[PDB]
Subunit: 624 residues, 2 copies
Amino acid sequence: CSLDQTVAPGNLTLCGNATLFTTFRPKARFIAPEGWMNAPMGLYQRADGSIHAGYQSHPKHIQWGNISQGAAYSSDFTSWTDFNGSEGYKTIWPSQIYDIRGVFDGSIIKEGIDGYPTILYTSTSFGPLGATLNEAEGTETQSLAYTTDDGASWIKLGYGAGQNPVIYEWPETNLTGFRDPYVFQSPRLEALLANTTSITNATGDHFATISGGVHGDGARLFLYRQHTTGEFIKWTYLGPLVTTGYKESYGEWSGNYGINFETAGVTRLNPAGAAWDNGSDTTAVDFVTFGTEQGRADHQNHWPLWAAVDYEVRDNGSIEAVIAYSGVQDWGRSYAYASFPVEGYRQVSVGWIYEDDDNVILAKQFGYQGAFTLFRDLFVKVVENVSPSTPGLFEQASWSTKNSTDGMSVTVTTLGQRVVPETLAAYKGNSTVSTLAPVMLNESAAAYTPFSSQPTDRFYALTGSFEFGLNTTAKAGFRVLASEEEYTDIWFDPASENLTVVRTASSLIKSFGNDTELAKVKLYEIVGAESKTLNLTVFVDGSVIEIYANDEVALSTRAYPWLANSTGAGLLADGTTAGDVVGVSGLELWDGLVDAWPARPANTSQGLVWDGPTAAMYGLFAGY
Amino acid sequence: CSLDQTVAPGNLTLCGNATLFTTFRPKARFIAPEGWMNAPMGLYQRADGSIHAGYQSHPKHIQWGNISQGAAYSSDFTSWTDFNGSEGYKTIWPSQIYDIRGVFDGSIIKEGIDGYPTILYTSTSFGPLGATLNEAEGTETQSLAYTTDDGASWIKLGYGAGQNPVIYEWPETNLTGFRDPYVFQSPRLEALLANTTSITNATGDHFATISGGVHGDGARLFLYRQHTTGEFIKWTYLGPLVTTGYKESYGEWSGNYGINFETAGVTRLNPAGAAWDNGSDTTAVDFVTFGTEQGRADHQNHWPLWAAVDYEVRDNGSIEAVIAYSGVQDWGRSYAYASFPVEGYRQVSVGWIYEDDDNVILAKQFGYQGAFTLFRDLFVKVVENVSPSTPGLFEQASWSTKNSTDGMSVTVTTLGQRVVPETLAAYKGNSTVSTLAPVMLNESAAAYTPFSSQPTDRFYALTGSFEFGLNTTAKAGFRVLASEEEYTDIWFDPASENLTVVRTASSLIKSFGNDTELAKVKLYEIVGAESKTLNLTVFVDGSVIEIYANDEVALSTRAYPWLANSTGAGLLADGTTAGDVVGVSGLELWDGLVDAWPARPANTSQGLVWDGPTAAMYGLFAGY
Ligand SMILES: *[C@@H]1O[C@H](CO)[C@@H](O[C@@H]2O[C@H](CO)[C@@H](O[C@@H]3O[C@H](CO[C@H]4O[C@H](CO[C@H]5O[C@H](CO)[C@@H](O)[C@H](O)[C@@H]5O[C@H]5O[C@H](CO)[C@@H](O)[C@H](O)[C@@H]5O)[C@@H](O)[C@H](O[C@H]5O[C@H](CO)[C@@H](O)[C@H](O)[C@@H]5O)[C@@H]4O)[C@@H](O)[C@H](O[C@H]4O[C@H](CO)[C@@H](O)[C@H](O)[C@@H]4O[C@H]4O[C@H](CO)[C@@H](O)[C@H](O)[C@@H]4O[C@H]4O[C@H](CO)[C@@H](O)[C@H](O)[C@@H]4O)[C@@H]3O)[C@H](O)[C@H]2NC(C)=O)[C@H](O)[C@H]1NC(C)=O
Ligand SMILES: *[C@@H]1O[C@H](CO)[C@@H](O[C@@H]2O[C@H](CO)[C@@H](O[C@@H]3O[C@H](CO[C@H]4O[C@H](CO[C@H]5O[C@H](CO)[C@@H](O)[C@H](O)[C@@H]5O[C@H]5O[C@H](CO)[C@@H](O)[C@H](O)[C@@H]5O)[C@@H](O)[C@H](O[C@H]5O[C@H](CO)[C@@H](O)[C@H](O)[C@@H]5O)[C@@H]4O)[C@@H](O)[C@H](O[C@H]4O[C@H](CO)[C@@H](O)[C@H](O)[C@@H]4O[C@H]4O[C@H](CO)[C@@H](O)[C@H](O)[C@@H]4O[C@H]4O[C@H](CO)[C@@H](O)[C@H](O)[C@@H]4O)[C@@H]3O)[C@H](O)[C@H]2NC(C)=O)[C@H](O)[C@H]1NC(C)=O
Ligand SMILES: *[C@@H]1O[C@H](CO)[C@@H](O[C@@H]2O[C@H](CO)[C@@H](O[C@@H]3O[C@H](CO[C@H]4O[C@H](CO)[C@@H](O)[C@H](O[C@H]5O[C@H](CO)[C@@H](O)[C@H](O)[C@@H]5O)[C@@H]4O)[C@@H](O)[C@H](O[C@H]4O[C@H](CO)[C@@H](O)[C@H](O)[C@@H]4O[C@@H]4O[C@H](CO)[C@@H](O)[C@H](O)[C@@H]4O)[C@@H]3O)[C@H](O)[C@H]2NC(C)=O)[C@H](O)[C@H]1NC(C)=O
Ligand SMILES: *[C@@H]1O[C@H](CO)[C@@H](O[C@@H]2O[C@H](CO)[C@@H](O[C@@H]3O[C@H](CO[C@H]4O[C@H](CO)[C@@H](O)[C@H](O[C@H]5O[C@H](CO)[C@@H](O)[C@H](O)[C@@H]5O)[C@@H]4O)[C@@H](O)[C@H](O[C@H]4O[C@H](CO)[C@@H](O)[C@H](O)[C@@H]4O[C@@H]4O[C@H](CO)[C@@H](O)[C@H](O)[C@@H]4O)[C@@H]3O)[C@H](O)[C@H]2NC(C)=O)[C@H](O)[C@H]1NC(C)=O
Ligand SMILES: *[C@@H]1O[C@H](CO)[C@@H](O)[C@H](O)[C@H]1NC(C)=O
Ligand SMILES: *[C@@H]1O[C@H](CO)[C@@H](O)[C@H](O)[C@H]1NC(C)=O
Ligand SMILES: *[C@@H]1O[C@H](CO)[C@@H](O)[C@H](O)[C@H]1NC(C)=O
Ligand SMILES: *[C@@H]1O[C@H](CO)[C@@H](O)[C@H](O)[C@H]1NC(C)=O
Ligand SMILES: *[C@@H]1O[C@H](CO)[C@@H](O)[C@H](O)[C@H]1NC(C)=O
Ligand SMILES: *[C@@H]1O[C@H](CO)[C@@H](O)[C@H](O)[C@H]1NC(C)=O
Ligand SMILES: *[C@@H]1O[C@H](CO)[C@@H](O)[C@H](O)[C@H]1NC(C)=O
Ligand SMILES: *[C@@H]1O[C@H](CO)[C@@H](O)[C@H](O)[C@H]1NC(C)=O
Ligand SMILES: *[C@@H]1O[C@H](CO)[C@@H](O)[C@H](O)[C@H]1NC(C)=O
Ligand SMILES: *[C@@H]1O[C@H](CO)[C@@H](O)[C@H](O)[C@H]1NC(C)=O
Ligand SMILES: *[C@@H]1O[C@H](CO)[C@@H](O)[C@H](O)[C@H]1NC(C)=O
Ligand SMILES: *[C@@H]1O[C@H](CO)[C@@H](O)[C@H](O)[C@H]1NC(C)=O
Ligand SMILES: *[C@@H]1O[C@H](CO)[C@@H](O)[C@H](O)[C@H]1NC(C)=O
Ligand SMILES: *[C@@H]1O[C@H](CO)[C@@H](O)[C@H](O)[C@H]1NC(C)=O
Ligand SMILES: *[C@@H]1O[C@H](CO)[C@@H](O)[C@H](O)[C@H]1NC(C)=O
Ligand SMILES: OC[C@H]1O[C@](O)(CO)[C@@H](O)[C@@H]1O
Ligand SMILES: OC[C@H]1O[C@](O)(CO)[C@@H](O)[C@@H]1O
């Protein structure tokens, strides 16, 4: 095992555990100290204003198992501190018959048991568990725990009748899944149900969704309501909130609804952020965010989706969320998005970016797997004065259109996502910032043009505004993590409406994924404009490449170049001519970003362990 | 629910939980504070000389489940003190994937991990578990924990490779069971194996048996040897120590070997007690004690047995224990005998006495189930100068015979059991003792003759020596827990060699068991004697009736008379005549015994709880 990054990579599978720990590792984002992580969980803003973030965690392993809540906190979403207790950075772990198979995703009741922050989580026990298996009632249940020390530790309710687990009966037969309770308050849903509470007797101020589906018949999001205000044991099933078909797709802009939902949440937004009105705010829109499984040929069979919904009240005192339009939260290697309320009328969303080593070839050598996305403010994106000749505009696929009275312009509404401003400000202020001169891409443009200032390592951000002709067939974008021999190309092709990440040359190491990422991006053309513009922001953080377009489209992916000098960046141009020109402006490079875990040393590995021969006997966890 | 014990019992199933807590409850013996108990476990004499006793425990329930180690200590086997920690009187409980289904029986390595007392116990996980089910490897494994505070708490080794569980591979396929590790030192077995240690490389000073069997092919006791002295992770399977046939019986004196062993142990004894020689003591005998299941039509399908064995060394460096003779440790409602070494060359044995309410009709009303037997010194019982005309003597069923050189007398050898002297001394000294005049039972004897002094409650002991003619057909014994309407009759019938406990009138409450208990007792006739003698000792302790004959035969049973005055006792006589006379002498009543738990109040119930609907979903525990 040579770690010489000035020459071609050897056989890196001969390298020891965690010998590649720092080589590809993000430094500017949320990530576990070591080992396996997946979904964000237990997210809440604490009483002191700081953010608590939990995550599915398996320390000292590089595959999933004994799944626990790891946790940390931050005052600005950006610089984090690990909790440290008797179980290291874990704060909830399998410990009881009802959750011994895994402490799965959960969400926070801010004023819960005895007034304390309280988590409702999926407690798993033995038996087949999965949407493609024959799962039985009891394998996935929902349980409570509360914290008296602001998330340093959690106390579970006792096991038994009238205690944990608090939700165990399947609301319908033959479920594909029954997990990921999302607890939320909703003046909107309270107002809608107020005339029917005699039918169900459920009058509490908290709702909870549980994610699942029905074998052979598509995904389901089940709605529960807290039976009585101030009491947290009894939750009453109202009915299915979202019902989709077996591998149903709303189309090219909307992924696929698969066979089962995971990590679903419910929110209400307006142009400024979170909306807490009862329906009276005409600018507010109800949204569901949700993962789906088995509706995708790649990306671990997982789509992270969202839908705008219109609520209807059923005669039995339940709610049907009718999908109005449907989109994708991130088009790349991310999943398990969670959202949570933040002071100042905000709803903040964060997901999990998995590695691109699906055959587990170099995972042990890493000594870790996974990171978070950046934290994102959700809001209703409104585009005014949109031209009716915008191609495909009235398909209204992942957006809505409202015509002006005279029919000559359109207002477009969709889900907006932008990186939280605290992170952008901290990144910029800690970086060496190069404001770059605008670049006109025409007949003289090379395929690749390095920026006039270059990054110094694998931790940087780029921004640019690409102005295209309305009938362009030119392509342009950014190349990142680039040397002569390794590079990753981010292209936008307005003619096809496709944003791609080409990774055929991303790394000399051949075991990592190299498939082309793809997102659809609608450039809403503005009335009177003779051009259309793509604002593209790119974060490069170790191996993470996280792309944002127009405060709307997100695409997270991975690149693992071996060579030490595969850190360069610049502009890409294809088919730019004297006549078909691409004007690039607002160009800026931020080199360095922020050290997100300042108390951690560079190498936080504690080694890796094997569960031994019993792992295969129990059949629950891979064991490593 | 009336608790009026001066009139006939009502419908006691209407009574609330623990309303009958004190009514039938033993006071003079080891018993949990409340709830369910079964097998003794984790028995050892601590460094300060006191006795640690563990037991299988399920607090606040009256059926088995979440099985844990409850514990207490005593300086004299007789007066006990509960441990009190974060889990009450529990000291080990299900907490890890490998033992979440139950912390089953285990035994003590006195100088174990880091020099501390260490328990090797059966750690159970999910899956079918039982001799009549299709159990799979991994469901029962063996794990270690150690104590740094003399049994107040135990620290388990970590889960994983080279740690817990330490024994997990089945030594043969298709096991009926794989549990109850019994760890012991044996100069005898070390000497026998010393010439073969190159074959196995196992050279440690601790052995361990594991109890089980093979489907369709009878019970097995598997022998392991610690691989290396001072190291406790690696245990090497040598081979089967005891192999018996599917429902094989050695005969009328020996119960039945069933299909699977439980709670088996290995010891070596001589006439004084425990023997720790290498084979050089010609008075010493090797013994195995073991429970069997599914070889009995009643008594919960459980025989608590013992066998004298002769060890042979196999060519592969293992030991075959060849059964020389085979007996019964207790003939009544007891099981799960454990034995442990005690200072002064002693081996002390104690078992579990179950209730006689197999349909669980009044268990909730009790608020508890189960007690221990008394603690018993084991030794080799030797009877000298036995007459060769003793009927059935040369069948040598649960004893051995050695003829004198001249053939006119026999030395009989068998397993001896007697109540530990500390308990007899404490009982006697705390009781009101009545030494009774001898009673000749002849033609004038009534069926029942009350003693001249009577007990004052349900806590007393009786002794008597019954001298019978060599050709008697008379029966005699003791009646206990007696009023006019309720009584329990203990008869010996020398002609049939049967000791019986007739319980047809034991209680007016009809839901308790009323079947006749039966033990075989051999009166070894002495050369020159014109009579044969039965020394009978009886302990009455709440509902327990525990009978000892001749420091050899034990029979534990239950009687639950309702009436407050069903406490009397006296002599029984049947077929005594002028010619066929029974001389009773050495008669003594001890009224009161000892308060075995002086710190406990009379009612230590904490109420009972239900596990809720998930108990049936998990399918592991009854739930109550
Ligand atoms: C199989 O068997 C298993 C083992 O028995 C069993 O698991 C156990 O289940 C029981 C029953 O559910 C659990 O007991 C509960 O414990 C809760 C506290 O849990 C936390 O703290 C304990 C104890 O912590 C001490 O000890 C540890 C270990 O040494 C130390 O680390 C601590 O620092 C602390 O040490 C101090 O105290 C010790 C004595 O206790 C001293 O010895 C020591 O010197 C120190 O001074 C921990 O062990 C727990 O850890 C475990 O669990 C966590 C998850 O929670 C895991 O992460 C971890 O790994 C461990 O597994 C944990 O940290 C109690 O709060 C709870 O008590 C209440 O509930 C019951 C039932 O409702 C009531 O009877 C009782 O009154 C309590 O309720 C009152 O209080 C709460 C909160 O204040 C109120 O909300 C409630 O309304 C009520 O209020 C009442 O009083 C008020 C007056 O003040 C009044 O206003 C109200 O009106 C009202 O009247 C309960 O005791 C036990 O934790 C489990 N143990 C383990 C190891 O798992 C398992 O379930 C079984 N399985 C099956 C299938 O049956
Ligand atoms: C799923 O996830 C689960 C959760 O992660 C996981 O379970 C956990 O597994 C880990 C790994 O096996 C366990 O970690 C071990 O813990 C042992 C100690 O366990 C006891 O103590 C802990 C901690 O106690 C503190 O905290 C509690 C809770 O708050 C308090 O109640 C205590 O009072 C105490 O509090 C103080 O300390 C805190 C900080 O720790 C402070 O915050 C606090 O303020 C106080 O000051 C308890 O939690 C345990 O309780 C649990 O387990 C018991 C059963 O054991 C249950 O009954 C109970 O309900 C709980 O479930 C328990 O009481 C450690 O000893 C052990 O440490 C060693 O082993 C590793 C690996 O070999 C070594 O790396 C390490 O060095 C240690 O070994 C050394 O020391 C031992 C003994 O001294 C030596 O024998 C050994 O040779 C070695 O010596 C070395 O150093 C010497 C120098 O001194 C030198 O001479 C030698 O040569 C050598 O170099 C390990 O940390 C953890 O307990 C589990 N937790 C739970 C909750 O279950 C589970 O397995 C996962 N499942 C799967 C399937 O993966
Ligand atoms: C005295 O001690 C007990 C603990 O032993 C304690 O708790 C009670 O425990 C008993 C069991 O001993 C429980 O009985 C079961 O109840 C089930 C139905 O329960 C529902 O209705 C009840 C009556 O209105 C409610 O009280 C229950 O509420 C509690 O539980 C819910 C969770 O569901 C919780 O949200 C609440 O807060 C409460 O805690 C609940 O709504 C029965 O289904 C169950 O069924 C059987 O048992 C009977 C007796 O054997 C049979 O007659 C039935 O046919 C059936 O059993 C069958 O046979 C076997 C059973 O193993 C099986 O093979 C068959 O399929 C079939 O099941 C049972 O009756 C009782 O619910 C529970 N009460 C509680 C928790 O309040 C007491 O509280 C304690 N008393 C005091 C004063 O402290
Ligand atoms: C680096 O980090 C690892 C943790 O990841 C850590 O521990 C090692 O972990 C690996 C797994 O990553 C273990 O590999 C397995 O080993 C099994 C055989 O193990 C036996 O032989 C070893 C070699 O001599 C010994 O080291 C082992 O001793 C340990 O464990 C025993 C308990 O058994 C214990 O008493 C000792 O004290 C030691 O702790 C042991 O005697 C293999 O069976 C297992 O099998 C597969 O994996 C391969 C790679 O994928 C495949 O090539 C095989 O075909 C096979 O996998 C197949 O595919 C899948 C697997 O999921 C399945 O469907 C098929 O049926 C089939 O199984 C595997 O190779 C390794 O044993 C373990 N080492 C330990 C604990 O020492 C390292 O220690 C750490 N390094 C450092 C320096 O810290
Ligand atoms: C980068 O490193 C490679 C290999 O060490 C070398 O070919 C070249 O000089 C360096 N710069 C490039 C390719 O831009
Ligand atoms: C990181 O630390 C681990 C654990 O000490 C060690 O095994 C590994 O070699 C280290 N890796 C590097 C690259 O420093
Ligand atoms: C309410 O009605 C809907 C639509 O028929 C149904 O799916 C749901 O199960 C009902 N809710 C109940 C039975 O609680
Ligand atoms: C919703 O709120 C508006 C004003 O904020 C109020 O007029 C209306 O009555 C509310 N709707 C309900 C609660 O029915
Ligand atoms: C919206 O505007 C377009 C273009 O003017 C027109 O084709 C369409 O019919 C309009 N829709 C409505 C509902 O008026
Ligand atoms: C650098 O980052 C830290 C941590 O996020 C932040 O608090 C600080 O404001 C940043 N420095 C600047 C903007 O100069
Ligand atoms: C074509 O592009 C080059 C490089 O940006 C620029 O110098 C030149 O002025 C452009 N041509 C025109 C006609 O703008
Ligand atoms: C653009 O993307 C779609 C998938 O949404 C694909 O079918 C089409 O071939 C792509 N076209 C080009 C030119 O990249
Ligand atoms: C015992 O009590 C019963 C019922 O109260 C009564 O018949 C009798 O007087 C008492 N004594 C007996 C039967 O020896
Ligand atoms: C014993 O105590 C328990 C728990 O407090 C109580 O429910 C029960 O009625 C008591 N029984 C008696 C006979 O005192
Ligand atoms: C040793 O031999 C006996 C008798 O054949 C056998 O039962 C046992 O399994 C053997 N021990 C092994 C294979 O370790
Ligand atoms: C057993 O012990 C005796 C004396 O106690 C000794 O003579 C003999 O050599 C020992 N047997 C062994 C260890 O082979
Ligand atoms: C009474 O019993 C206690 C506890 O076993 C014992 O220590 C004491 O010696 C006994 N009293 C006597 C023999 O007088
Ligand atoms: C017969 O028994 C009675 C009662 O023990 C006794 O008084 C009498 O002396 C006995 N008869 C003979 C002949 O011993
Ligand atoms: C004595 O016991 C045996 C069982 O061991 C039984 O078969 C026999 O019938 C009994 N005989 C009498 C007279 O009780
Ligand atoms: O780690 C388990 C968790 O991960 C998910 O499967 C999402 O990928 C959740 O549905 C579940 O709670
Ligand atoms: O409680 C479980 C324990 O009880 C037994 O079955 C004996 O009756 C043991 O074999 C086991 O360890």
